Amino acid sequence: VDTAVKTSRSGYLQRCIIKHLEGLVVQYDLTVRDSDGSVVQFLYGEDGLDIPKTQFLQPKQFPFLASNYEVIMKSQHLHEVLSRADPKKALHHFRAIKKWQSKHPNTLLRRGAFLSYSQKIQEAVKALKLESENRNGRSPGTQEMLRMWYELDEESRRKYQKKAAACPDPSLSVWRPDIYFASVSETFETKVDDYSQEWAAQTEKSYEKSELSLDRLRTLLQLKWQRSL
Amino acid sequence: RITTPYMTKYERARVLGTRALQIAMCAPVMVELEGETDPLLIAMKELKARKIPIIIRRYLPDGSYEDWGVDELIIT
Amino acid sequence: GILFEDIFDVKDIDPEGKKFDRVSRLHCESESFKMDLILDVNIQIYPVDLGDKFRLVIASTLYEDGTLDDGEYNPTDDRPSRADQFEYVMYGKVYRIEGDETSTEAATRLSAYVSYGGLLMRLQGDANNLHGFEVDSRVYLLMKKL
Amino acid sequence: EEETYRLWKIRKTIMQLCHDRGYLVTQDELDQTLEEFKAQSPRRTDLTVLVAHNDDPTDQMFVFFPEEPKVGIKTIKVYCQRMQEENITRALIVVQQGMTPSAKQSLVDMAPKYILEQFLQQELLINITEHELVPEHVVMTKEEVTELLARYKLRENQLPRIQAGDPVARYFGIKRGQVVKIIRPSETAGRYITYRLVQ
Amino acid sequence: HGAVIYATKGITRCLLNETTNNKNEKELVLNTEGINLPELFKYAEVLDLRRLYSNDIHAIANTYGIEAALRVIEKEIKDVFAVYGIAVDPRHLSLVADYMCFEGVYKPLNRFGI
């Protein structure tokens, strides 16, 4: 009795979703757009990438792709695509991101130019601001900081700004993952770094000759990403 | 000039279909067929040799288009 | 063309408890070397028992005169001086060599895993005398009871 | 002495809200604990703050904490006078029970001359912006929206919408017609970036 | 019977399901069977108000915004499919949630949404 009732319930729900989502198609710009021209998504699932071709791009399979490097490179990717593919624009972006994240371990710490010019905090609290009340609600000691910062600092060399600037925006956002080599997602490059570090420390104690280098495996993975798009 | 350089699978399908419908309508085959009666096999033979004078006109969602040559397109 | 030769003696007939039909996994232990051998042997063809000795050899060629093997099987071969002093001959490939676990210690022991179609063997012992092996290398396992 | 805990939480949340809008706030205000808040400051007229903007030093904002649990048109005028005389343009009125419904359209009626805005007191007890699921919003500048529309060949309509009463559009004080960049922390792609037109 | 001494609007009962983790088993959760988000903001020192979750998706969309309701929609669909072992890929729920919440509100996927 139950199986019969369930088929009607599910079939109506598919028709409703199908009637609404039917015109959402990936476009040459890589955006999922409706027939109106409306942009539902700017990359298909937050990163391009078709659910079918992403099965072996999962950490737990670089072990398999490494073992079959020669067929995977020869039969599908080709050594040529590596020859026609250049990564400088995307590689420099990831270096900038890495440097930023190196200077800011806690990325929820309220970066700011003026906030960065609170290291004199002790300089002010020692003796300077000891005499006032809450003039306009701020503080007796906050007004000294405001005065010292405001116009008693260099004209164009008061560059506490650079020590407090935003993280570079993700590469897929700026560098067009399709026509730009090495422009991958921020979660894939982390996996590739982890695996390269755990794979260069396995070749050392391997008793089998490996004719693959960490920086050919990296290009292999980057091509296999760029092609699953 | 900004879209992908490769030939999507939908483009390959439509180009093969159109070249086959042309061959079947008595069009000259520039591929030196070797005894095959299928126009789709001939169209694949032509696509592999890079002899298809068709212009894929990729349309962007605002009406703007880009004209690519079937020769200047990386067939996987 | 020998890569290893020794005289073992069977210590355990099948400790793990996994029991297959015609195959038996012997746990031996060398003499005068104290090397260890795990060996899957087809016992329907070649019965083996406990407290049994046997001379065991691993080779890369059966000719024992230098000429390499061609990778092709002919039951019609006219060179018949190939090692036949041995009752049970197998033919497999080494698929894993792994230095022993112990760090901060010499621990220069190696475990060589060989597959003989589906019958696995593991030779564990001083690396000094397991150098002839290398992954993906074809080897013959000749055996002869005593 | 729970009134003081509420006052301290609201003041900390308003300092964070003013720093996220780009106003000059010191670290001590953002890292002020209760024992020192109560040490400094009891009342509801000396909690009023006046903050300056990173650029446009004339462009400053003024935060009110009315006494009346239900602010009315007269209460609004009494310190719209304060703003008009001190020569400020923006304000922020933290109300304890609500605003009588005519007041909401009065605050709206005051043209860009004196643009005000209301916040309930229970809306400021915590910083929603610090929730796990809330992404980071960034009001794009007039020259970045143009480059976006040019890169995607878009129009300003035909972009996803964010309501002008959105709890995170009211916090970041984003007027209508402004595009906001949103950095979703995605489990799939890391740091997905989206855009929403405020309307 | 319908005369109640006093109750938080919308909450019918709480309960502390002692353990929710093995990795960091020390976790405690104050689950509820009603929904009033602001009436918990007063306990930001007793309870973690970041990590607050509700299955309502209209209440989240009113206290935290629409970009926070997207993820609640996705997690709700995922947890609905999980009870049967089914596992739809996240790239599909992302698109469904982005379409539903396109124009600033949680819009139904039905006859009045068209």
mmCIF file of C-alpha atoms in Angstrom, chain D:
data_model
loop_
_atom_site.group_PDB
_atom_site.id
_atom_site.type_symbol
_atom_site.label_atom_id
_atom_site.label_comp_id
_atom_site.label_asym_id
_atom_site.label_seq_id
_atom_site.Cartn_x
_atom_site.Cartn_y
_atom_site.Cartn_z
ATOM 1 C CA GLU D 1 23.432 45.183 37.872
ATOM 2 C CA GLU D 2 22.364 43.215 34.812
ATOM 3 C CA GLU D 3 21.471 46.506 33.144
ATOM 4 C CA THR D 4 25.219 47.156 33.149
ATOM 5 C CA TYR D 5 25.980 43.823 31.486
ATOM 6 C CA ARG D 6 23.450 44.661 28.777
ATOM 7 C CA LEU D 7 24.882 48.162 28.351
ATOM 8 C CA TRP D 8 28.393 46.723 28.033
ATOM 9 C CA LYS D 9 27.402 44.090 25.479
ATOM 10 C CA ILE D 10 25.521 46.685 23.429
ATOM 11 C CA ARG D 11 28.441 49.120 23.564
ATOM 12 C CA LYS D 12 30.912 46.439 22.475
ATOM 13 C CA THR D 13 28.620 45.378 19.633
ATOM 14 C CA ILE D 14 28.214 48.994 18.516
ATOM 15 C CA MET D 15 31.978 49.537 18.596
ATOM 16 C CA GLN D 16 32.397 46.467 16.390
ATOM 17 C CA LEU D 17 29.609 47.706 14.105
ATOM 18 C CA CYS D 18 31.321 51.096 13.819
ATOM 19 C CA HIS D 19 34.699 49.518 13.084
ATOM 20 C CA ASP D 20 33.198 47.273 10.399
ATOM 21 C CA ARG D 21 31.767 50.394 8.746
ATOM 22 C CA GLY D 22 35.252 51.930 8.697
ATOM 23 C CA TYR D 23 35.218 54.349 11.621
ATOM 24 C CA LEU D 24 38.230 55.211 13.768
ATOM 25 C CA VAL D 25 37.913 52.897 16.781
ATOM 26 C CA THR D 26 40.829 52.027 19.119
ATOM 27 C CA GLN D 27 41.767 48.461 20.158
ATOM 28 C CA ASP D 28 40.829 49.097 23.810
ATOM 29 C CA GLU D 29 37.181 49.851 22.870
ATOM 30 C CA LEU D 30 37.073 46.617 20.809
ATOM 31 C CA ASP D 31 38.817 44.693 23.623
ATOM 32 C CA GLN D 32 37.101 46.413 26.557
ATOM 33 C CA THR D 33 36.003 44.122 29.376
ATOM 34 C CA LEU D 34 33.137 44.658 31.810
ATOM 35 C CA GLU D 35 35.277 45.527 34.834
ATOM 36 C CA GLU D 36 36.810 48.468 32.962
ATOM 37 C CA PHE D 37 33.644 49.522 31.143
ATOM 38 C CA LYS D 38 31.894 49.956 34.490
ATOM 39 C CA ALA D 39 35.083 51.628 35.719
ATOM 40 C CA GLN D 40 34.835 54.279 32.995
ATOM 41 C CA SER D 41 31.073 54.508 32.403
ATOM 42 C CA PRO D 42 25.512 54.760 35.269
ATOM 43 C CA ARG D 43 23.311 56.626 32.793
ATOM 44 C CA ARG D 44 22.018 56.467 29.228
ATOM 45 C CA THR D 45 23.182 59.878 27.985
ATOM 46 C CA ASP D 46 26.929 59.385 28.580
ATOM 47 C CA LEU D 47 26.901 56.156 26.578
ATOM 48 C CA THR D 48 26.394 58.257 23.436
ATOM 49 C CA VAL D 49 29.399 57.895 21.146
ATOM 50 C CA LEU D 50 30.620 60.094 18.300
ATOM 51 C CA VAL D 51 32.955 58.401 15.824
ATOM 52 C CA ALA D 52 34.987 59.695 12.892
ATOM 53 C CA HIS D 53 35.522 58.143 9.478
ATOM 54 C CA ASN D 54 38.862 56.895 8.160
ATOM 55 C CA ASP D 55 38.601 59.342 5.261
ATOM 56 C CA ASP D 56 36.367 62.394 5.104
ATOM 57 C CA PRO D 57 37.133 63.497 8.689
ATOM 58 C CA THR D 58 34.026 65.684 8.502
ATOM 59 C CA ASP D 59 32.018 62.508 7.822
ATOM 60 C CA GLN D 60 31.280 61.312 11.347
ATOM 61 C CA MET D 61 28.529 59.258 12.953
ATOM 62 C CA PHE D 62 26.632 59.692 16.198
ATOM 63 C CA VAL D 63 25.131 56.830 18.225
ATOM 64 C CA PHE D 64 22.138 57.485 20.461
ATOM 65 C CA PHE D 65 20.740 55.486 23.381
ATOM 66 C CA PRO D 66 17.332 57.053 24.047
ATOM 67 C CA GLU D 67 15.847 56.791 27.522
ATOM 68 C CA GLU D 68 12.240 56.280 26.418
ATOM 69 C CA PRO D 69 11.624 52.529 25.963
ATOM 70 C CA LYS D 70 9.419 53.533 22.982
ATOM 71 C CA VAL D 71 10.955 56.434 21.061
ATOM 72 C CA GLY D 72 8.576 58.849 19.360
ATOM 73 C CA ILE D 73 8.624 61.698 16.849
ATOM 74 C CA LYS D 74 9.464 64.246 19.548
ATOM 75 C CA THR D 75 12.379 62.180 20.858
ATOM 76 C CA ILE D 76 13.661 61.962 17.292
ATOM 77 C CA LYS D 77 13.446 65.727 16.788
ATOM 78 C CA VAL D 78 15.129 66.508 20.116
ATOM 79 C CA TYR D 79 18.452 65.078 18.914
ATOM 80 C CA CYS D 80 17.968 65.679 15.222
ATOM 81 C CA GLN D 81 18.428 69.199 16.578
ATOM 82 C CA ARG D 82 21.667 68.071 18.250
ATOM 83 C CA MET D 83 22.883 66.601 14.958
ATOM 84 C CA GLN D 84 21.876 69.642 12.900
ATOM 85 C CA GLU D 85 23.683 72.002 15.279
ATOM 86 C CA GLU D 86 26.846 69.933 15.813
ATOM 87 C CA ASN D 87 26.970 69.608 11.993
ATOM 88 C CA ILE D 88 26.768 65.842 11.521
ATOM 89 C CA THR D 89 24.799 63.885 8.932
ATOM 90 C CA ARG D 90 24.475 60.307 10.215
ATOM 91 C CA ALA D 91 23.041 58.804 13.382
ATOM 92 C CA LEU D 92 22.242 55.456 14.971
ATOM 93 C CA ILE D 93 19.403 55.129 17.472
ATOM 94 C CA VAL D 94 19.470 52.121 19.806
ATOM 95 C CA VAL D 95 15.927 51.667 21.136
ATOM 96 C CA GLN D 96 14.887 49.472 24.088
ATOM 97 C CA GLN D 97 11.309 48.426 23.123
ATOM 98 C CA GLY D 98 10.837 49.671 19.572
ATOM 99 C CA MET D 99 9.824 52.826 17.770
ATOM 100 C CA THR D 100 6.159 53.851 17.657
ATOM 101 C CA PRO D 101 5.211 52.979 14.014
ATOM 102 C CA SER D 102 4.891 56.621 12.771
ATOM 103 C CA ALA D 103 8.553 57.193 13.803
ATOM 104 C CA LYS D 104 9.941 54.593 11.356
ATOM 105 C CA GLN D 105 8.608 56.623 8.340
ATOM 106 C CA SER D 106 9.854 59.856 9.926
ATOM 107 C CA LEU D 107 13.434 58.579 10.111
ATOM 108 C CA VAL D 108 12.893 57.668 6.463
ATOM 109 C CA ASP D 109 11.334 61.074 5.731
ATOM 110 C CA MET D 110 14.465 62.987 6.762
ATOM 111 C CA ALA D 111 16.179 63.377 3.391
ATOM 112 C CA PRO D 112 19.919 62.707 2.901
ATOM 113 C CA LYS D 113 20.279 65.910 4.917
ATOM 114 C CA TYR D 114 20.173 63.879 8.162
ATOM 115 C CA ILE D 115 20.007 60.127 7.516
ATOM 116 C CA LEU D 116 19.192 58.182 10.692
ATOM 117 C CA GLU D 117 18.683 54.486 11.405
ATOM 118 C CA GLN D 118 17.280 52.426 14.274
ATOM 119 C CA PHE D 119 18.530 49.291 16.021
ATOM 120 C CA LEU D 120 16.693 47.288 18.633
ATOM 121 C CA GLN D 121 18.601 46.558 21.814
ATOM 122 C CA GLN D 122 18.024 42.807 21.529
ATOM 123 C CA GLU D 123 19.502 42.898 18.017
ATOM 124 C CA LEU D 124 22.852 44.154 19.349
ATOM 125 C CA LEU D 125 23.384 41.738 22.240
ATOM 126 C CA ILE D 126 25.502 39.630 19.858
ATOM 127 C CA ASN D 127 27.380 40.248 16.618
ATOM 128 C CA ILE D 128 25.521 38.224 13.994
ATOM 129 C CA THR D 129 28.463 38.922 11.673
ATOM 130 C CA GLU D 130 30.446 36.520 13.891
ATOM 131 C CA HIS D 131 28.157 33.531 13.281
ATOM 132 C CA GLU D 132 29.583 30.442 11.603
ATOM 133 C CA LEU D 133 27.158 30.569 8.666
ATOM 134 C CA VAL D 134 27.280 34.329 8.000
ATOM 135 C CA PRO D 135 29.905 35.067 5.315
ATOM 136 C CA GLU D 136 31.991 38.237 5.037
ATOM 137 C CA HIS D 137 30.262 41.156 3.301
ATOM 138 C CA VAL D 138 32.242 43.946 1.626
ATOM 139 C CA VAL D 139 30.582 47.037 0.185
ATOM 140 C CA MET D 140 32.096 47.410 -3.280
ATOM 141 C CA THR D 141 33.244 50.826 -4.440
ATOM 142 C CA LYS D 142 31.655 52.627 -7.374
ATOM 143 C CA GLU D 143 34.655 51.753 -9.560
ATOM 144 C CA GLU D 144 34.662 48.025 -8.763
ATOM 145 C CA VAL D 145 30.980 47.521 -9.588
ATOM 146 C CA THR D 146 31.580 48.998 -13.041
ATOM 147 C CA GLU D 147 34.466 46.608 -13.684
ATOM 148 C CA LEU D 148 32.332 43.704 -12.458
ATOM 149 C CA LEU D 149 29.455 44.580 -14.791
ATOM 150 C CA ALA D 150 31.977 44.970 -17.613
ATOM 151 C CA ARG D 151 33.705 41.644 -16.948
ATOM 152 C CA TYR D 152 30.449 39.678 -16.773
ATOM 153 C CA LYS D 153 28.658 41.875 -19.342
ATOM 154 C CA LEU D 154 25.876 42.343 -16.794
ATOM 155 C CA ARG D 155 23.289 44.929 -15.879
ATOM 156 C CA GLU D 156 22.665 46.002 -12.301
ATOM 157 C CA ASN D 157 19.284 44.325 -12.399
ATOM 158 C CA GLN D 158 19.847 40.697 -13.440
ATOM 159 C CA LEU D 159 22.077 40.327 -10.308
ATOM 160 C CA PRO D 160 21.072 38.503 -7.115
ATOM 161 C CA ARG D 161 19.246 40.707 -4.635
ATOM 162 C CA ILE D 162 19.843 41.476 -0.973
ATOM 163 C CA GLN D 163 16.969 43.080 0.886
ATOM 164 C CA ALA D 164 17.443 46.596 2.221
ATOM 165 C CA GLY D 165 16.081 45.366 5.558
ATOM 166 C CA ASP D 166 18.449 42.392 5.619
ATOM 167 C CA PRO D 167 19.953 41.949 9.108
ATOM 168 C CA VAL D 168 23.405 42.219 7.497
ATOM 169 C CA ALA D 169 22.555 45.108 5.179
ATOM 170 C CA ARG D 170 21.164 47.107 8.146
ATOM 171 C CA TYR D 171 24.389 46.327 10.114
ATOM 172 C CA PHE D 172 26.823 47.352 7.348
ATOM 173 C CA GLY D 173 24.612 50.371 6.642
ATOM 174 C CA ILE D 174 24.379 49.747 2.916
ATOM 175 C CA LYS D 175 22.070 52.057 0.979
ATOM 176 C CA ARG D 176 20.019 50.911 -1.970
ATOM 177 C CA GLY D 177 21.686 50.411 -5.331
ATOM 178 C CA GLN D 178 24.992 49.330 -3.782
ATOM 179 C CA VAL D 179 26.564 46.002 -4.720
ATOM 180 C CA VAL D 180 28.094 43.938 -1.913
ATOM 181 C CA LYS D 181 30.748 41.279 -2.414
ATOM 182 C CA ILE D 182 30.250 38.171 -0.288
ATOM 183 C CA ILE D 183 33.012 35.696 0.554
ATOM 184 C CA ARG D 184 31.321 32.401 1.365
ATOM 185 C CA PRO D 185 33.619 29.922 3.107
ATOM 186 C CA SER D 186 32.689 26.903 0.998
ATOM 187 C CA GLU D 187 33.544 23.321 1.911
ATOM 188 C CA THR D 188 33.799 22.663 -1.844
ATOM 189 C CA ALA D 189 35.925 25.535 -3.198
ATOM 190 C CA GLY D 190 37.266 27.328 -0.123
ATOM 191 C CA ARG D 191 36.441 31.025 -0.568
ATOM 192 C CA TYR D 192 33.657 31.409 -3.133
ATOM 193 C CA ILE D 193 32.885 35.035 -4.073
ATOM 194 C CA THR D 194 29.361 36.218 -4.915
ATOM 195 C CA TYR D 195 27.750 39.610 -5.491
ATOM 196 C CA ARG D 196 24.381 40.993 -4.417
ATOM 197 C CA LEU D 197 22.683 44.261 -5.336
ATOM 198 C CA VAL D 198 21.104 45.895 -2.292
ATOM 199 C CA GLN D 199 17.404 46.437 -2.932
#
